[PDB]
Structure 1
Amino acid sequence: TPYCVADYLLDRLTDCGADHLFGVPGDYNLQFLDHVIDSPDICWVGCANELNASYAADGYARCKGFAALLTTFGVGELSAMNGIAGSYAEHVPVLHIVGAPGTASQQRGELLHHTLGDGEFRHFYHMSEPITVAQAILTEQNACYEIDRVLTTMLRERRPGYLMLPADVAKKAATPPVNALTLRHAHADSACLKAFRDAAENRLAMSKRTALLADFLVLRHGLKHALQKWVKDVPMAHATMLMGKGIFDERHVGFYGTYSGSASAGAVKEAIEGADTVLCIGTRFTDTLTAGFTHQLTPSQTIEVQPHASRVGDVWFTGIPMLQAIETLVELCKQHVHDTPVPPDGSLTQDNFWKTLQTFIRPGDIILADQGTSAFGAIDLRLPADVNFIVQPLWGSIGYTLAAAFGAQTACPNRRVIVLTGDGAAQLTIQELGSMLRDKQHPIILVLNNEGYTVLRAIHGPEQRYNDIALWNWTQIPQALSLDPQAQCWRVSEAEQLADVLEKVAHHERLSLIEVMLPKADIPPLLGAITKALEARNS
């Protein structure tokens, strides 16, 4: 019962914004889990494996701004490694807690289970260094301030951190903090900010019209409000790329569609690439987001804002918080921007599938799309207001979407969750559907059944057997992963049928699994343009 390091960690964890802890137990963390169970502030969420748990934590942090994952030493942590890496790649603040053997056992070099048999206990700690921003081995002498330093670094960088918690250290006495862990707002040096403002002001005084391109880093740094308000006060052509989709209400004036480099719609190209001044806010021009680096945006044409630095033309201004750079640009845009941007089929195909989905989505939806024709077709959806669109095109790990949806629904139990996963992707993390059923979640899961890896087929070897998959009976999965699923599952092959099923599952009273029958070679237009561009770089 006495307050201890385990309780301190859980206290700090809630301060950061996580009300749940994902993971799977092991003998090295059971005593820590006692404090999780006993805590009135954090809810334990056992998952079906550690990889899914790390994915779910990622989806949770994309909804609540923070997440935590608990695994056991060695077998647990190394299983979650692909998940933490994806969190690092896409700037998701997920805390990895690793329950470990007591320090005396470690110092004695004992041949314990979950080790390499060499008596070494730091292999996996060091292996996790490239995919976290901060890390620590908690000791009796450092525990509380190493907890605080790692979590603070995660909050500042919006990226994963790692804590190793030996069983004995977790029971060490601690003191409840009077002060809650605070996200200290950084302020740039006044001269540096003025120098950035002066160069931006000179550049913005050049613009004949200005366009705004924002992406996922404004989502991670809690700047969604700022960019929405910014387009309101200064109406201009604005867009996101795939990663940042959902920043804006896509029905509003000034929005013409998602930007994907040369794969963009013609109206979008003129809106973004045709503007003489483009403001890039939190952008990363990855190969997928630019359809093979086919974006036409010169440095002199752009003003770029990143988490700790901003660029005007060829000059970088470092040590400037993203927020201040945005407030500067918003203030300057009220000065120099003056323009107003003048305020049902038979057989299912990709084209009519997404057309049907367009009529189904609603404000407040949480939409998750996996790599493949799912995410590459979802890019064409015109999202209404208050849509959380979760996609992972930089890391691109298939299977993330199904497990991340379990985490997202846990984060937002009162919101309608739409899961768009390919058949290939869903096989990698299928067991989390059981967790969804056990927790009585009601997402609308759409499995795109094209009988294999269609995006791989389009890239190379459509004929090749390695692009096939085992053919599952998708509508029967919930009845196997639950003793009383109470789900409603359909297998659809016509647009009429799909539209009717959508109205039936509209109010998500039960878990819904819709198996969508699609052709093997049918690809959305973004994938077509991606493969066309691949002719040059991949030969």
Structure 2
Amino acid sequence: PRGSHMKLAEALLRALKDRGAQAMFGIPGDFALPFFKVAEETQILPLHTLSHEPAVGFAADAAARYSSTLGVAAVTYGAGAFNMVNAVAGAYAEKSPVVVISGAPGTTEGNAGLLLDTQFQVFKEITVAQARLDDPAKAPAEIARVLGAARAQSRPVYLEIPRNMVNAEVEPVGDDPAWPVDRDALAACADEVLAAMRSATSPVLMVCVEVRRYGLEAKVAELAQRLGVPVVTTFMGRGLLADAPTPPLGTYIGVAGDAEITRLVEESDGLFLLGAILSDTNFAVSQRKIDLRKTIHAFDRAVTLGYHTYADIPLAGLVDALLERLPPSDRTTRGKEPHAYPTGLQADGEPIAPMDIARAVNDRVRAGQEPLLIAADMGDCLFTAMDMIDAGLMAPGYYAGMGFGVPAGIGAQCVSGGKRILTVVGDGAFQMTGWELGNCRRLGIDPIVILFNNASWEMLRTFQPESAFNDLDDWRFADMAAGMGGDGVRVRTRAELKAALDKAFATRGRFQLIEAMIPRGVLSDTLARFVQGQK
């Protein structure tokens, strides 16, 4: 029976494709050359290379988020892998399953004690599972275990492949090992959660990151309708249940958000955090701001309330168990008025402010343009994008690490099947990774990038205006665009901005860089409310 076998590298690539992976981003090196050869020759997964490892990690993260599937980031041993630590930490922080595949010395090549392994130890700190595939007999089961963990916890995993093992013959990779659930514990959990929601004077259902990652939108829309309580999304749950019978009242983003939404969440005595990342992070739900004696935290395959925890409870299982205990309903709240986005750009000779950029994007949408998914870097560009009409928003809202923007827009467009991506990024972040746009030609994509150039690390000036080190030079980004294959244009007035955005949407084939000059001291409304809130 069966008796077939293939190269270890091929078995791994097929296992990834079997699980929904859509591409492999990476930068090779001597130790990883053999693995990249197999990837290129077999063509199991499209192979996209980038310039610098941070972008490889950010692009793989973005692709994972775009399709709620596994992302794949391939690097070489040593500097290549260490150079992707931050991007992988960001994916871990925001629950994105990036599969890190690093080449490594052959099993016979002994060691290389320059750092005396250190790389494996470092990656153990930022992934949920790891495996060094140095035994062909056990490789298939180890691949299934590690990929299975990535899918079960929606976080990065690490696979190290000695180069002499790339071509080792192995059996095909089977299904993820099962993480069975205790039916009795699950029943008890669902019973307590439901009882808690029914006894609360003000229950609130928060739809969060895991709902999207695990593709539970349909099931949760049904749960929300039956539960009958107010629905609110977290920053990473933005957009969920938009088409549901009972869409979210809004999104909680902390102090800078709608005061009515903030109060509803923070004063709830039955706060059901369905799949939420909790942290004292800027836009996240913080344990310090909610009632811990009444919160129900369903996250990381556990459910916590009243300071006690039900272990090994997958979110999907919890949702189904609650559905089994709730009668159907025909209730709806879709008769309400939609959200009011800032519109009406005054295309005149006045200088540009972040909100003008928001109005420019929103007007095209109102005029008939189908919204584009937006990839945002960290900075006022993100605070501005929150007031933009989108077809999804991808940003390091909790991790807050810079450099994600451009590479994410690139990674997303690589797997969007034709959908164009809009990227917003500040000058500081662009100096870090905006250069990756030079790869658009080879990748066959043409994202639109609005660069907020205030020749400043403005979020830092805002918190400490007396410092001079936040004053950056004026880099002529638009002028540098042609050198890396795109069409760039520097705009200084709202009129030029309006014109430049229309031109970008009308021009395909090359990335379009709109360099918007913004004076220092000028912020988006959301960042302003955020700063005032801190004071």
TM bucket (normalised to shorter chain) is: 0.7 to 0.9
Could you tell me how far apart the structure 1 residues matched to 2:415 and 2:334 are?
37
The structural deviation recorded for 1:336 is: 9.9
What whole-Å deviation, never above 9, does each CA across 1:214-235 have from its counterpart, x for those lacking one? 2222222222333344446666
1:245 and 2:238 aligned: yes
Give the aligned partner of residue 102 of structure 1: 106
Which one of the candidate residues 53, 56, 70 is aligned to 1:53?
A: 56
Q: Check if 1:66 corresponds to 2:73.
A: no
Deviation of 1:300 after TM superposition, in Å, equals: 4.3
Q: Secondary structure at the match of 2:445?
A: coil
- Find the partner of 2:183 among 161, 165, 190: 190
Conserved 8 A contact 1:402-1:421: yes
Write the letter of the residue equivalent to 1:38.
E
The alpha carbon displacement at 1:197 in A equals: 2.2
Partner of 1:410: 414
8 Å CA contact 2:226–2:326 kept in 1: the answer is no
Distance 2:129 2:259 in 1: 43
- Residues of 2 paired with 1:167 and 1:530: CA distance? 50
Matching residue's letter, 1:80 = M
Q: For residue 300 of structure 2, what is the amino acid of its counterpart? A: P
**Once the two structures are superposed, what CA deviation does each residue of 1:303-349 show, in whole Å capped at 9, x if it has no partner?**
33213112344443222111122234455565799795863334322
Query: Deviation at 1:33?
Result: 1.6
Q: Give, as a single letter, the amino acid of the residue that structure 1 aligns with 2:493.
A: E
- Give 1:49 shift: 1.4
How far the C-alpha of 1:457 sits from its partner, in A, is 0.6
Q: Deviations over 1:23-54 (max 9, x none)?
A: 11111122222211111321221110112111
In the alignment, which residue of structure 2 is the partner of 1:19? 22
Deviation at 1:173, TM superposition (A): 1.6
Q: Distance in 1 between matches of 2:42 and 2:476?
A: 41
Q: In the alignment, what sits opposite 1:262?
A: 255
Structure-2 separation of matches of 1:348 and 1:331: 54
Q: 1:335 to 1:230 in 2, by over 3 A?
A: closer
Contact 2:492 2:516 in 1 (8 A): yes
Residues 71-470 of structure 1: pairs in structure 2 closer than 5 A? 71-106=75-110, 109=111, 115-117=112-114, 122-141=117-136, 142-176=138-172, 179=174, 181-182=175-176, 184=178, 188-207=181-200, 210-231=203-224, 237-249=230-242, 254-269=247-262, 271-273=264-266, 277-290=270-283, 293=286, 296-330=289-323, 334=327, 343=336, 344-345=345-346, 346-361=350-365, 365-381=372-388, 383=390, 387-460=391-464, 462-470=465-473
Q: Provide the identity percentage.
A: 26
Shift of 1:125: 1.2
1:432-476 alpha-carbon deviations (Å, 9 max, x no partner): 11112332311111101111110011111x343321234221112
Given the two structures, how large is their TM-score scaled by the length of structure 1? Answer: 0.86
Q: Give 3-state SS (helix, strand or coil) of 1:48's partner.
A: coil
The alignment of Structure 1 onto Structure 2 pairs a total of residues equal to: 514
Residue 41 of structure 1, aligned match among 38, 41, 44: 44
**1:112 paired residue number:** none
Q: Distance in 1 between matches of 2:258 and 2:288?
A: 13
Q: What whole-Å deviation, never above 9, does each CA across 1:350-389 have from its counterpart, x for those lacking one?
A: 2332233333456563211111101122223354xxx231
Q: Give distance in 1, aligned partners of 2:333 and 2:200.
A: 14
How much has 1:261 moved relative to structure 2?
2.5
Unmatched tracts of structure 2, length 5 or more: 337-344
Partners of 2:309 and 2:104 lie apart in 1 by 44
Letter paired with 2:488: C
Compute the displacement of 1:296 (Å). Answer: 4.5
Equivalent residue, structure 1, for 2:8: 5
CA-based RMSD of the aligned residues comes to 3.0
Q: TM-score normalized by structure 2?
A: 0.87
Comparing 361-370 with 391-400, which one deviates more in the overlay? 361-370
Given the alignment of the two structures, is residue 488 of structure 1 paired with residue 491 of structure 2, yes or no? no
Q: Which runs of 5+ in 1 are unaligned?
A: 110-114
Shift of the 360–223 alpha-carbon distance from structure 1 to 2, 3 Å rule, reads farther
AA at the equivalent of 2:505: A
Distance 1:303 1:381, change over 3 A: farther
The amino acid across from 1:369 in the alignment is A
- In structure 2, the partner of 1:504 is 503
Would the aligned equivalents of 1:258 and 1:379 in 2 still touch at CA under 8 Å?
A: no
Separation (CA, whole Å) in 1 of partners of 2:507 and 2:324: 43
Q: Which residue of 1 aligns with 2:342?
A: none
The alignment status of 1:517 with 2:524, answered yes or no, reads no
CA shift at 1:421, angstroms? 0.7
